[PDB]
């Protein structure tokens, strides 16, 4: 069950200065980057173009190229359309994609955030506001929904293009998605909380537990998954223990990259 994400972030400083940058993920591996400075989108994998032709892709890019410019002036206008009710600096984010299921089933989304909070989504055949949204946003929504061209285009990308493209992206990048990377573990302690550092493992599902032989230690405190530049995962597990009980306790690791041979390292 994979989730595909296009991520946009635009900042409008004042009435004349702004920028817009984007990035694209399949699950936890990055597929595209589009800088504000760059006139074209970039691939960050060899298989980023999925099963799309060169012509197909170049069409799709040009659409977006136009979009970026349009979108800038539009936000700026929509400010004039509020003011003095609204004011700079303004921060906008959009998250859009489709999440894949068994068979042919998928569900697409387009989610917008104004000034850090989620306010607008595209749903069905038009833009709507979500619960919690400030009322004044109704007027913009009304203008956005006035534009039938845009609506058409957006339904198409969300209904058809996204899934089709991901189904194709999933084939062309299966090697990297199903790639297995073996975790490297080391221990230490700080004034005593003992740490089991795990680093370099892929995919992200992992099982890390402290053991006294076979007694599964319940005082084990798992951290957050942090990334490494080479696109592997780092995690750590801390155990709060009394002085002396260092010798004996060991860290056990379950991962698909090992294949039955569990990492086990003793203090």
């Amino acid at each position: 069950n994979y989730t595909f994400r296009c991520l946009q972030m635009s900042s409008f400083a004042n009435r004349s200065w702004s920028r817009t940058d984007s990035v694209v993920w399949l699950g936890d591996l990055q597929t595209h980057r589009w800088s504000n400075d760059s006139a074209t989108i970039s691939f960050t994998k060899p298989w980023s173009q999925g099963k799309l032709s060169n012509q197909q892709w170049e069409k799709l890019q040009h659409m977006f190229q136009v979009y970026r410019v349009s979108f800038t002036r539009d936000i700026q206008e929509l400010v004039k359309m509020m003011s003095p009710k609204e004011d700079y600096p303004i921060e906008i984010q959009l998250s859009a994609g489709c999440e894949m299921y068994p068979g042919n089933a998928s569900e697409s989304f387009l989610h917008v955030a104004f000034q850090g909070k989620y306010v607008v989504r595209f749903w069905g055949t038009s833009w709507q506001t979500v619960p919690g949204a400030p009322s004044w946003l109704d007027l913009p929504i009304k203008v956005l929904n006035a534009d039938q061209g845009t609506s058409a285009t957006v339904q198409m990308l969300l209904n058809d293009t996204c899934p089709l493209f991901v189904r194709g992206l999933l084939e062309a990048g299966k090697s990297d998605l199903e790639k297995q990377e073996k975790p490297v573990a080391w221990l230490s302690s700080v004034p005593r909380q003992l740490v089991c550092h795990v680093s370099g493992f892929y995919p992200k599902p992992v099982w890390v537990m402290w053991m006294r032989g076979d007694q599964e230690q319940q005082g084990t405190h798992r951290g957050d998954f942090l990334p490494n530049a080479d696109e592997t995962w780092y995690l750590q597990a801390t155990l709060d223990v009394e002085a002396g009980e260092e010798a004996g306790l060991a860290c056990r690791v379950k991962h698909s990259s090992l294949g039955g041979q569990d990492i086990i390292l003793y203090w």
Epitope: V66, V69, S70, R73, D74, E77, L78, K80, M81, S83, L139, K142, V143, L144, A146, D147, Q148, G149, T150
Partner: T-cell receptor, first 111, second 113 residues
Framework: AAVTQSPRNKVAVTGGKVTLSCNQT?????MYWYRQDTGHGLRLIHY???????EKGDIPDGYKASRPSQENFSLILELATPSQTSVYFC??????????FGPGTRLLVLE | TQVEQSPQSLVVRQGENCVLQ??????????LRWFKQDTGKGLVSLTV?????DKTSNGRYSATLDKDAKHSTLHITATLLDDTATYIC?????????????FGAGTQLIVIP
């Protein structure tokens, strides 16, 4: 969808003060001031998204605009010059694209 | 001036047909509209074209739009004396109030009675 202008025709003097006025009873949020000159299409001077707002257009220099209310939009030449001799169109419209144009106002600025 | 009209002006005999041209570079190009303007008078809309390859007709007026070519033509069938007017080409860059209109300077027609 009606748009009216007053006056329809006006003679003024360099350095004088002229007010062109536009009235719309369509409850349109949006109103726009343009000027027509030969060898040119309509160019946008000022526009407004609602009461007590004005926005600079493409050629705003020498004009100032005022939106006292939803129904009225005004173009104000404070220090009239011969170059501001033109025909002025006002229009209005809602969230759609269509703009509805007034009948025009001729202005002549003499020395 | 991303909107260019041609011919600049032309003279025809009543009952003849004529064709007027509009070529533009405006991006994007949501819709294109034709206006008739009588001397001294204001702007009467005649037609508005919206699709990628579009055709409209309104009485003796008919028009085509082709967005790939970014080109439009207005045809007047069986001109009458009242057709003596300037014809103006207008291109709007959005399909909402967020757009700006882009005006050609028009083509001057004189029908000879």
């Amino acid at each position: 969808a009606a748009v009216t202008q007053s006056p329809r025709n006006k003679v003024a003097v360099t350095g004088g003060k002229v007010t062109l006025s536009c009235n719309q009873t369509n409850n349109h949020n949006n109103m726009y001031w343009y000027r027509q000159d030969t060898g040119h299409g309509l160019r946008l001077i000022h526009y407004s998204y609602g009461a007590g707002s004005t926005e600079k257009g493409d050629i705003p220099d020498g004009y100032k605009a005022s939106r006292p209310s939803q129904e009225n939009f005004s173009l104000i030449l404070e220090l009239a010059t011969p170059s501001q001799t033109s025909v002025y169109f006002c229009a209005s419209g809602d969230e759609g694209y269509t703009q509805y144009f007034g009948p025009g106002t001729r202005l002549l600025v003499l020395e | 001036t991303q909107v260019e009209q041609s011919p600049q002006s032309l003279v025809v005999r009543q009952g003849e047909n004529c064709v007027l041209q509009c070529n533009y570079s405006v991006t994007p190009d949501n819709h294109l509209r034709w206006f008739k303007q009588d001397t001294g008078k204001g702007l009467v809309s005649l037609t508005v074209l919206v699709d990628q390859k579009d055709k409209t007709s309104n009485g003796r007026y008919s028009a085509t739009l082709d967005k790939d070519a970014k080109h439009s033509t207005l045809h007047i069938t069986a001109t009458l004396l009242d057709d003596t007017a300037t014809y103006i080409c207008v291109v709007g860059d959005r399909g909402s109030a967020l757009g700006r209109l882009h005006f050609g300077a028009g083509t001057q027609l004189i029908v000879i009675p």
